[PDB]
Write a protein that binds this ligand. Structure first.
Ligand SMILES: Nc1cccc2c1CNCC2
Length: 150
């Protein structure tokens, strides 16, 4: 009973979280996951500022009201060569990664590891934070509040 959460650097408080290495987070689960990090889904404005500080990914993820990919460098296999905060317009499906926003993070790039999940609640799941440099932090708990998500 195990969940891996792959996390990025923070940029103006905004970071990306991927569950189990694949698109697998619903919009309800995304809000609960950010809440476990003492964070919220970013607004578009928060995401644009993060982009301006160096944030880019190649993965769709939730922000408050849209699903996006922040892009700095044009890449043909990431958001169809677009730059800026690329907004997903048309999709059949409902599960993506998430972005999260932590107001307590540093104002610019913070590429230190994440070593806690401060607002997880009691539960039976082994939750492992995996950083890009491989650094791991594990704890037993739960973050999902909606039964539809388990
Ligand atoms: N960001 C991160 C952290 C740990 C593992 C992985 C990522 C990004 N996606 C590939 C795997």
């Amino acid at each position: 009973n195990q969940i891996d959460l792959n996390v990025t650097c923070r940029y103006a408080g905004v970071f990306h979280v991927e569950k189990n290495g694949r698109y697998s987070i619903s919009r309800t689960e995304a809000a609960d996951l950010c809440q476990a990090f003492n964070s919220t889904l970013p607004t578009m404005d928060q995401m644009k500022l993060a982009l301006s500080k160096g944030f880019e990914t190649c993965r769709y993820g939730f922000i408050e009201g849209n699903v996006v990919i922040p892009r700095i460098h044009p890449n043909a296999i990431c958001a169809a060569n677009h730059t800026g905060v690329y907004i997903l317009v048309t999709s059949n499906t409902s599960h993506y990664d998430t972005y999260c926003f932590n107001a307590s993070a540093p104002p610019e790039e913070d590429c230190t590891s994440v070593t806690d999940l401060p607002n997880s609640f009691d539960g039976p799941v082994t939750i492992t934070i995996v950083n890009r440099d491989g650094t791991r932090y594990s704890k037993k708990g739960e973050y999902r509040t909606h039964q539809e998500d388990i």
